[PDB]
Design a protein around this ligand. Structure first.
Ligand SMILES: *[C@@H]1O[C@H](CO)[C@@H](O[C@@H]2O[C@H](CO)[C@@H](O)[C@H](O)[C@H]2NC(C)=O)[C@H](O)[C@H]1NC(C)=O
Ligand SMILES: *[C@@H]1O[C@H](CO)[C@@H](O[C@@H]2O[C@H](CO)[C@@H](O)[C@H](O)[C@H]2NC(C)=O)[C@H](O)[C@H]1NC(C)=O
Ligand SMILES: *[C@@H]1O[C@H](CO)[C@@H](O[C@@H]2O[C@H](CO)[C@@H](O)[C@H](O)[C@H]2NC(C)=O)[C@H](O)[C@H]1NC(C)=O
Ligand SMILES: *[C@@H]1O[C@H](CO)[C@@H](O[C@@H]2O[C@H](CO)[C@@H](O)[C@H](O)[C@H]2NC(C)=O)[C@H](O)[C@H]1NC(C)=O
Ligand SMILES: *[C@@H]1O[C@H](CO)[C@@H](O[C@@H]2O[C@H](CO)[C@@H](O)[C@H](O)[C@H]2NC(C)=O)[C@H](O)[C@H]1NC(C)=O
Ligand SMILES: *[C@@H]1O[C@H](CO)[C@@H](O)[C@H](O)[C@H]1NC(C)=O
Ligand SMILES: *[C@@H]1O[C@H](CO)[C@@H](O)[C@H](O)[C@H]1NC(C)=O
Ligand SMILES: *[C@@H]1O[C@H](CO)[C@@H](O)[C@H](O)[C@H]1NC(C)=O
Ligand SMILES: *[C@@H]1O[C@H](CO)[C@@H](O)[C@H](O)[C@H]1NC(C)=O
Ligand SMILES: *[C@@H]1O[C@H](CO)[C@@H](O)[C@H](O)[C@H]1NC(C)=O
Ligand SMILES: *[C@@H]1O[C@H](CO)[C@@H](O)[C@H](O)[C@H]1NC(C)=O
Ligand SMILES: *[C@@H]1O[C@H](CO)[C@@H](O)[C@H](O)[C@H]1NC(C)=O
Ligand SMILES: *[C@@H]1O[C@H](CO)[C@@H](O)[C@H](O)[C@H]1NC(C)=O
Ligand SMILES: *[C@@H]1O[C@H](CO)[C@@H](O)[C@H](O)[C@H]1NC(C)=O
Ligand SMILES: *[C@@H]1O[C@H](CO)[C@@H](O)[C@H](O)[C@H]1NC(C)=O
Ligand SMILES: *[C@@H]1O[C@H](CO)[C@@H](O)[C@H](O)[C@H]1NC(C)=O
Ligand SMILES: *[C@@H]1O[C@H](CO)[C@@H](O)[C@H](O)[C@H]1NC(C)=O
Ligand SMILES: *[C@@H]1O[C@H](CO)[C@@H](O)[C@H](O)[C@H]1NC(C)=O
Ligand SMILES: *[C@@H]1O[C@H](CO)[C@@H](O)[C@H](O)[C@H]1NC(C)=O
Ligand SMILES: *[C@@H]1O[C@H](CO)[C@@H](O)[C@H](O)[C@H]1NC(C)=O
Lengths: 1017, 200, 122, 50
């Protein structure tokens, strides 16, 4: 009956070799997973229709299926392609043939049903010379048969199989084999079976876009049917067979009209065209007639089709699309001219009539209608009743009738009563005679001037209106004004003279129906973007589709404020945002497993145990290391505008010169960018006047720096971590890349110097000279800088060193396993790479030209026509470069800001110690270490984080002998029995003494003072 | 729509205020460690070179001055609309940019008519594509102008957002030593408030 | 190429290779070498001697110093490093030094110095 | 920007008054439109850079 097409039906669309590329092409392909009709050889095979292409396949073991018949009537009236493979001679014929009710060949042929006629043949080809059992099949032979404009293209692929089942699953491309140069109108076809298993399949092709994957051998190895489902659409949008987790905007939903609405005023009057075109006498050009035609039905098909007019040339309007337009008024200007004067009656034209007797507007939107009158206006011996004006002291404005017969003054001599020298009359006449030449016979010309629907129309063509349907998306036409939208009732009180409404934006808001005077609002039918929400293809092929800003009543289903989300399950439980949708809603792939939608969690809910006499003081701490990655530079580029736009073409370059400085301002802007990339790098890394190096003995107090210090054993003296970073981040069109001024080795040396300085001299090398200091003591200062007494470090030095070393190991494990850690830098590389690829792709665009390749234009057209096509390409390619450069300048500004930030951090974190909260990571900043990365810098921020807190009772002050004692440092705390004073960031209780506190005032002003004693040592 | 609704922003500012009030700056570095507010202020005073006893001796005065200052803030915001001009202009610039873009659809750009459907309904293809190409060129250029202006404006907004985040971190979450970074005077504390497309 | 394929394409859709219609071999088409030309010069208040850098080409079709920025002609290659003066790229800078002539060198990153670190000396 | 006024942009002449004084309107607007397009694009480039 039917089977499922398992990705079969893919062929090489053309004869171009491609490799290691995903190419998007639109052609006639077999849709994926479509139904194909399953036919059998045993137990009589019908004739099927042919429809824009046929996919044919058969499975063979004994060559039972031997041929095909293609045509429309199969009755000797038309050409029909017949293909027969009779194990000896492959035969292709296009002869005319009368076939039997069931044509077949017996097993060599033993019966006569091969054919019965041989007449009117136009092509013959024969190739070289070269059982009936049932079972599993041995040979699968897939074919594609298509007819394009005149070429009958046959593609096929033969493959060994050992199977009985229908259409095995896998992927295999069909190569072309035959191209027959004959245009046959094919509407039906039939196959040919050998009669003493062997089934075959018939599918049908549709115009679909497919994404084809070419491997290293130029063999098509996979494909995506771009209209199979939202996931395939996503794949097409990203030009990849792997989709990262996220939400992509892939298409646009648009509601289509269901029916058309044609509305016109219910006027039954017919326009008096007969009284103008069929008139006894036409007027003279000096006094041409102008009849206004209005309030009538104008049938313009009769006048156009009548075979009586010498010319019918229309400007502004097309001569065929004239019935579906209507006018406020139409005027018919009717007069007789000489045949040779037809060329002068046109907008933009000049001559003795165009300037003196009939001038047209240069924006005229009408038609020039003409026919000869040699048998009507002409008279024997010359008909002298048609007057013209060959002299005038002034030029007519458009549509002026200069009736005045004043004596023309060719000079300053007196006239108007004189017909002597330089006083002549301007009116002269014609003698129309039946024997004069073609160019001298009279012609009756009527010019019909049509204005546009700038106001209510009264003259519409002979087409009946229809009824109006409300609240549905329709294609409406109100008095010739057309559009698409839903027509609804309205409460907008139009005044009797008002016909149309407008919005603030000048769009049509509403119209009054010309037959029944009610006001209808026009709301364009619902549309919106379509986004696909998907987990990465390494997890699941399930997707959800978001239809943006529409209701889901025209398209489980979850209505959100972002639109109606279909395919995602609504979950009451909140979670952390994963794939953002909008308006507080995120989606994720969770628990089998399915796509869910939920309101995002903003974090765990927590309350603080606040009271007026309780303070939490940390008793322990943790040293954490965070990684901050900043872009510093981007790949520097330089574009030769001439080679890009006008590659190796002198004429194109010469045309480019008419644009002045457009090139040099782009070369200059890109140069400026390239220079500042080196400035950015120099400002970030070259902040140290000398290149410092560590001692050979790494006696740093237990702190292990072997993973951030240069590794002397490497071919490039980079740190281990730097090597990890470099292993994660990954040209003849006038497009070049300049090298950076500072090579990676130089950057590594700069970071080495900064690390050695930081380690051996703390911050002193930044201000001036590098003053050596033991690392543990440096840390003591770093601790003092955050309000933690240096003795804490020394007492816990082993713990601190172990926590630091473990934190570093964790940094290494993260960088070694999570690629996304450096996404901030990879995207920059991708943005620049993408920008150039787009620019290159623009060279393939036509921009309105006959061809995108300039050399084919030059080799095909002579200069006088070729420069227009070239100018189109120059404009498009120049605009493309300008777009690129603007985007690069903006991106460069972003990079510069980032580089300035990185330099600021280098100075205030690595070279110093930062008091700016969260500037250099969360926690109390101690020190930072730079590491280089491709086109960027990585900072390792070492922070002190309070941990393991306890609830202590506290007090702002203690009364002793009536005096109020306040802490010099720390706060007063009580463990429930004894009062102590201790530092804010680390529990270290001390006896309260006069050397820890100070006295001011007495104990009667301060709120919360408690009674105690202060020990005097 | 924005990803974070106004309610979510309000909840974030609520969390920041409750943290600032009940734990000072400790919630920024790590865990929120409860502390009496008056003592928090004592540290804030010590941070500017004023001994903590000044706060305690004058605590009632300080609280009254703070409460009065807040009342004045409320009266100003409730009566002077121009106070938020810095945010209103941004809204206006974006609204104006779109209106201009829409107005460009009414332009002819050299064509016989700005409305494309009237061109298609009036001219046969062989002449109609020229008029259409003129409209395509004009409308495409108009979009490019809009997008470029939006990218530049976005860079301005990003710089402002980075500044706002910096202030949040070094003023609300901490205490600022940067002169006039967080207002004139010796900075004690700051409180965020949300606003349309911005922070106060 | 498969027997039915006549032309090749690159990722950018440029012609990469063709099959000769008379003798069926595949020929790669590489556009002939080109590149920007830069002039490295001290100011005209010092000298009228210049060096020319041919960007990203080999100097086998045009003393002569081959660098990763291209082949630099007219600048003398000096083993000694100095502070960068006129940057070329890839670590190479040029200057007018000692008669006098244009030189090219690998830039110095600063004086080399070591810190006398020990666990008990400040 | 000033130099761009000297450019033809495909027109028969960069000076607009010589176009107007030499061609009748029906042909002159095409040459003028070319100059308008070029000069308008030049200003847009200037403004974006500014
Ligand atoms: C291709 O052949 C088909 C015949 O199958 C043609 O269809 C016929 O078209 C004429 C119109 O002139 C109709 O009167 C016939 O009734 C149609 N036949 C059938 C069976 O419906 C089709 O027009 C041909 N096309 C071309 C381009 O020649
Ligand atoms: C402070 O915390 C550290 C760990 O963060 C503690 O060190 C751990 O102590 C336990 C003893 O119960 C050992 O079993 C662990 O192996 C230790 N870990 C490390 C990394 O040293 C330290 O004891 C804590 N100090 C206090 C006073 O609580
Ligand atoms: C600093 O840490 C590194 C590990 O990152 C130590 O190197 C390891 O040392 C052990 C000996 O304890 C060896 O077995 C490993 O094979 C070493 N690994 C590597 C990658 O070298 C290094 O010894 C530590 N430094 C000190 C002074 O202990
Ligand atoms: C609060 O801290 C004090 C100081 O250590 C504790 O007093 C000590 O308690 C231990 C045993 O409870 C005695 O052996 C010491 O002699 C006490 N010190 C003095 C100076 O007398 C007190 O117990 C702590 N209170 C609580 C509730 O933990
Ligand atoms: C701390 O000690 C002082 C003096 O020993 C107490 O002050 C006395 O408080 C009582 C009760 O309020 C009054 O009747 C006395 O007149 C006060 N004497 C003086 C000299 O002020 C104070 O109340 C004690 N505070 C606590 C919390 O025990
Ligand atoms: C294939 O055909 C069967 C029966 O005609 C039908 O039920 C099924 O839906 C068809 N499949 C597709 C994808 O149209
Ligand atoms: C195959 O068919 C062709 C068609 O004319 C015929 O000439 C040829 O002899 C046939 N071969 C056989 C019967 O082996
Ligand atoms: C085509 O075949 C018909 C069959 O009757 C025949 O009459 C006719 O002469 C042949 N030739 C042409 C050109 O039609
Ligand atoms: C295709 O590529 C493979 C790579 O392993 C190679 O061995 C093979 O010879 C190439 N050619 C063909 C026709 O497979
Ligand atoms: C003819 O037009 C009039 C004008 O309003 C309208 O009232 C009438 O119904 C129309 N007749 C038909 C048959 O549509
Ligand atoms: C004018 O007369 C000719 C021939 O008599 C006729 O074909 C034509 O249709 C007439 N015009 C109109 C508008 O009927
Ligand atoms: C991603 O795909 C690779 C190869 O297909 C696989 O090895 C890896 O485990 C996958 N990751 C996950 C998280 O499934
Ligand atoms: C969406 O459709 C539902 C179904 O009738 C309707 O009740 C609702 O008002 C519509 N509009 C919305 C949700 O904005
Ligand atoms: C979610 O909460 C609503 C409350 O309106 C309840 O009706 C619904 O059943 C809940 N769904 C689940 C899965 O808990
Ligand atoms: C502090 O006390 C409160 C209330 O007694 C309690 O909820 C909180 O968990 C305590 N904190 C610690 C660290 O024990
Ligand atoms: C705050 O402190 C006062 C004394 O200073 C005390 O009476 C009051 O109970 C405390 N607040 C609470 C909630 O206990
Ligand atoms: C003629 O063309 C054939 C086709 O390959 C080629 O082999 C032969 O060498 C050509 N002859 C000459 C003289 O070029
Ligand atoms: C630069 O030129 C001026 C005038 O030619 C001269 O006075 C000055 O000394 C020159 N500078 C150097 C460094 O040679
Ligand atoms: C440059 O030319 C030399 C000279 O033959 C050659 O050895 C070298 O491989 C060429 N290519 C380079 C240096 O990239
Ligand atoms: C530079 O060093 C190289 C070492 O390969 C040596 O051969 C060459 O002679 C040196 N040149 C000078 C001028 O010292």
């Amino acid at each position: 009956a039917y089977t499922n097409s398992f990705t079969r039906g893919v062929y090489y669309p053309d004869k171009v070799f491609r490799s290691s590329v995903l190419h998007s092409t639109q052609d006639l392909f077999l849709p994926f997973f479509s139904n194909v009709t399953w036919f059998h050889a045993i137990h009589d095979n019908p004739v099927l229709p042919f429809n824009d292409g046929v996919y044919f396949a058969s499975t063979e073991k004994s060559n039972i299926i031997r041929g095909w018949i293609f045509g429309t009537t199969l009755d000797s009236k038309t050409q029909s392609l017949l293909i027969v493979n009779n194990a000896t001679n492959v035969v292709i014929k296009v002869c005319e043939f009368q076939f039997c009710n069931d044509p077949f060949l017996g097993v060599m042929e033993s019966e006569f049903r091969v054919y019965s006629s041989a007449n009117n043949c136009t092509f013959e080809y024969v190739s070289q010379p070269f059982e009936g059992k049932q079972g599993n099949f041995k040979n699968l032979r897939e074919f594609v048969f298509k007819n394009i404009d005149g070429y009958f293209k046959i593609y096929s692929k033969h493959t060994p199989i050992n199977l009985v089942r229908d259409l095995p699953q896998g992927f295999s491309a069909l190569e072309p084999l035959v191209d027959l140069p004959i245009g046959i109108n094919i509407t039906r076809f039939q196959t040919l079976l050998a009669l003493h298993a062997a089934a075959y399949y018939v599918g049908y092709l549709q115009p679909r876009t497919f994404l084809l994957k070419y491997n290293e051998n130029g063999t098509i190895t996979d494909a995506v049917d771009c209209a199979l489902d939202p996931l395939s659409e996503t794949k097409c949008t990203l030009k990849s067979f792997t989709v990262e987790k996220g939400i992509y905007q892939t298409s646009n939903f648009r509601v289509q009209p269901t029916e058309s609405i044609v509305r016109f005023p219910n006027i039954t009057n017919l326009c008096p065209f007969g009284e103008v075109f069929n008139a006894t006498r036409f007027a003279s050009v000096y006094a041409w007639n102008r009849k206004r035609i209005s309030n009538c039905v104008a049938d313009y098909s009769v006048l156009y089709n009548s075979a009586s007019f010498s010319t019918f040339k229309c400007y502004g309007v097309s001569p065929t699309k004239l019935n579906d337009l209507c006018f406020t008024n139409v005027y018919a200007d009717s007069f007789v001219i000489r045949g040779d004067e037809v060329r002068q009656i046109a907008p933009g034209q000049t001559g003795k009539i165009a300037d003196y007797n009939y001038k047209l507007p240069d924006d005229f939107t009408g038609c020039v209608i003409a026919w000869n009158s040699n048998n009507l206006d002409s008279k024997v011996g010359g008909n002298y009743n048609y007057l013209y004006r060959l002299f005038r002291k002034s030029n007519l404005k458009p549509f002026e009738r200069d009736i005045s017969t004043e004596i023309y003054q060719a000079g300053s001599t007196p006239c108007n009563g004189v017909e002597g020298f330089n006083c002549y009359f301007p009116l002269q006449s014609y003698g129309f005679q039946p024997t004069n030449g073609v160019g001298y016979q009279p012609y009756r010309v009527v010019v019909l001037s049509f204005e546009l629907l700038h106001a209510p129309a009264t003259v519409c063509g002979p087409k009946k209106s229809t009824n109006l349907v409300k609240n549905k998306c329709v294609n409406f036409n109100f008095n010739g004004l057309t559009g698409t939208g839903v027509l609804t009732e309205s409460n907008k009180k139009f005044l009797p003279f008002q016909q149309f409404g407008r919005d603030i934006a000048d769009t049509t808001d509403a119209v009054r129906d010309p037959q029944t005077l009610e006001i209808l609002d026009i709301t364009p039918c619902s549309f919106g973007g379509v986004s696909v929400i998907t987990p990465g293809t390494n997890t699941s092929n399930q997707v959800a589709v978001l239809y943006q800003d529409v209701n889901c009543t025209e398209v489980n289903v979850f209505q959100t404020r972002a639109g109606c989300l279909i395919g995602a399950e609504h979950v009451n439980n909140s979670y952390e945002c994963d794939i953002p949708i909008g308006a507080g809603i995120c989606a994720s792939y969770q628990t089998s497993q399915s796509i869910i939608a939920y309101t995002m969690s903003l974090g765990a809910e927590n309350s603080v145990a606040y009271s007026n006499n309780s303070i939490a003081i940390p008793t322990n701490f943790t040293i954490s290391v965070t990684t901050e990655i900043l872009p510093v530079s981007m790949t520097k580029t330089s574009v030769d505008c001439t080679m890009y736009i006008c590659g190796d073409s002198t004429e194109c370059s010469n045309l480019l010169l008419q644009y002045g400085s457009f090139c040099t301002q782009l070369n200059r802007a890109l140069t400026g960018i390239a220079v500042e990339q080196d400035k950015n790098t120099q400002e970030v890394f070259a902040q140290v006047k000398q290149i410092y190096k560590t001692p050979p003995i790494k006696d740093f107090g237990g702190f292990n720096f072997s993973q951030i210090l240069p590794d002397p054993s490497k071919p490039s003296k980079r740190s281990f971590i730097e090597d990890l970073l470099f292993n994660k981040v990954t040209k003849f069109n006038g497009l070049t890349v300049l090298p950076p001024l500072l090579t990676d080795e130089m950057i590594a040396q700069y970071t080495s110097a900064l690390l050695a300085g930081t380690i051996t001299s703390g911050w002193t090398f930044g201000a001036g000279a590098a003053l050596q200091i033991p690392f543990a003591m440096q840390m003591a200062y770093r601790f003092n800088g955050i309000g933690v007494t240096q003795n804490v470090l020394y007492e816990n030095q082993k713990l601190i060193a172990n926590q630091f070393n473990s934190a570093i190991g964790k940094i290494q494990d993260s960088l070694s396993s999570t690629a996304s850690a450096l996404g901030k830098l990879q995207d920059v590389v991708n943005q620049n790479a993408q920008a150039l690829n787009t620019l290159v792709k623009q060279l393939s665009s036509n921009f309105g030209a006959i061809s995108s390749v300039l050399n084919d234009i030059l080799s095909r057209l002579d200069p006088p026509e070729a420069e227009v096509q070239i100018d189109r390409l120059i404009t498009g390619r120049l605009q493309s470069l300008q777009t690129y450069v603007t985007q690069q300048l903006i991106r460069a500004a972003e990079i510069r800001a980032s580089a300035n930030l990185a330099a600021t951090k280098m100075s205030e974190c690595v070279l110093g110690q930062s008091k700016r909260v969260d500037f250099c990571g969360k926690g109390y900043h101690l020190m930072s270490f730079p590491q280089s990365a491709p086109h960027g810098v990585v900072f390792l921020h070492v922070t002190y984080v309070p941990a393991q807190e306890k609830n202590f009772t506290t007090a702002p002050a203690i009364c002793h002998d009536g005096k109020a004692h306040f802490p010099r440092e720390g706060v007063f705390v009580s463990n429930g029995t004894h009062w102590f004073v201790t530092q804010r960031n680390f529990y270290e209780p001390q006896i309260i003494t006069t050397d820890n506190t100070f006295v001011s005032g007495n104990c009667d002003v301060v709120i919360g003072i408690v009674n105690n004693t202060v020990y005097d040592p």
